[PDB]
Amino acid sequence: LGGYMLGSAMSRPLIHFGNDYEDRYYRENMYRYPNQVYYRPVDQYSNQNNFVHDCVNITVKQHTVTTTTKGENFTETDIKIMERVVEQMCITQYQQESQAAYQRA
């Protein structure tokens, strides 16, 4: 995460899931299964999806590993979250960071 540009609070996708319970649950969880990720600045790398699974590996983790110490832990739902919000969002970077990392490079 040190050599990983924080994905400046992502696009806070808020997957909503189709369940306002979970819609709410991400809006509530966005400070943990959240609207932020860590990754390096990818000019879409013809596969940010790649750096994604690695970013979900850093971000859900930083929130369930350096953060499980705060008392904050995920469940496969909570993870299905970081995988829906983060695997998707970092994937969004596959298309979206070719924009931003084009900009920032």
Curated annotation (Swiss-Prot):
GO terms for molecular function: amyloid-beta binding; aspartic-type endopeptidase inhibitor activity; copper ion binding; cupric ion binding; cuprous ion binding; glycosaminoglycan binding; identical protein binding; microtubule binding. Disulfide bonds join 55-90. Its main location: membrane. Glycans are attached at residues 57, 73. Keywords: Amyloid, Cell membrane, Copper, Disulfide bond, Glycoprotein, Golgi apparatus, GPI-anchor, Lipoprotein, Membrane, Metal-binding, Prion, Repeat, Signal, Zinc. The keyword Metal-binding applies. It is found in: Cell membrane; Golgi apparatus. One of its GO terms (cellular component) is nuclear membrane. Coiled coil: none annotated. The keyword Metal-binding applies. GO terms for biological process: cellular response to amyloid-beta; cellular response to copper ion; cellular response to xenobiotic stimulus; intracellular signal transduction; learning or memory; negative regulation of activated T cell proliferation; negative regulation of amyloid-beta formation; negative regulation of apoptotic process. It is linked to Found in high quantity in the brain of humans and animals infected with degenerative neurological diseases such as kuru, Creutzfeldt-Jakob disease (CJD), Gerstmann-Straussler syndrome (GSS), scrapie, bovine spongiform encephalopathy (BSE), transmissible mink encephalopathy (TME), etc. Its primary physiological function is unclear. Has cytoprotective activity against internal or environmental stresses. May play a role in neuronal development and synaptic plasticity. May be required for neuronal myelin sheath maintenance. May play a role in iron uptake and iron homeostasis. Soluble oligomers are toxic to cultured neuroblastoma cells and induce apoptosis (in vitro). Association with GPC1 (via its heparan sulfate chains) targets PRNP to lipid rafts. Also provides Cu(2+) or Zn(2+) for the ascorbate-mediated GPC1 deaminase degradation of its heparan sulfate side chains. Belongs to the prion family. Monomer and homodimer. Has a tendency to aggregate into amyloid fibrils containing a cross-beta spine, formed by a steric zipper of superposed beta-strands. Soluble oligomers may represent an intermediate stage on the path to fibril formation. Copper binding may promote oligomerization. Interacts with GRB2, APP, ERI3/PRNPIP and SYN1. Mislocalized cytosolically exposed PrP interacts with MGRN1; this interaction alters MGRN1 subcellular location and causes lysosomal enlargement. Interacts with KIAA1191. The normal, monomeric form has a mainly alpha-helical structure. The disease-associated, protease-resistant form forms amyloid fibrils containing a cross-beta spine, formed by a steric zipper of superposed beta-strands. Disease mutations may favor intermolecular contacts via short beta strands, and may thereby trigger oligomerization. Contains an N-terminal region composed of octamer repeats. At low copper concentrations, the sidechains of His residues from three or four repeats contribute to the binding of a single copper ion. Alternatively, a copper ion can be bound by interaction with the sidechain and backbone amide nitrogen of a single His residue. The observed copper binding stoichiometry suggests that two repeat regions cooperate to stabilize the binding of a single copper ion. At higher copper concentrations, each octamer can bind one copper ion by interactions with the His sidechain and Gly backbone atoms. This is Major prion protein. It comes from Oryctolagus cuniculus. The lineage of its organism: Eukaryota, Metazoa, Chordata, Craniata, Vertebrata.
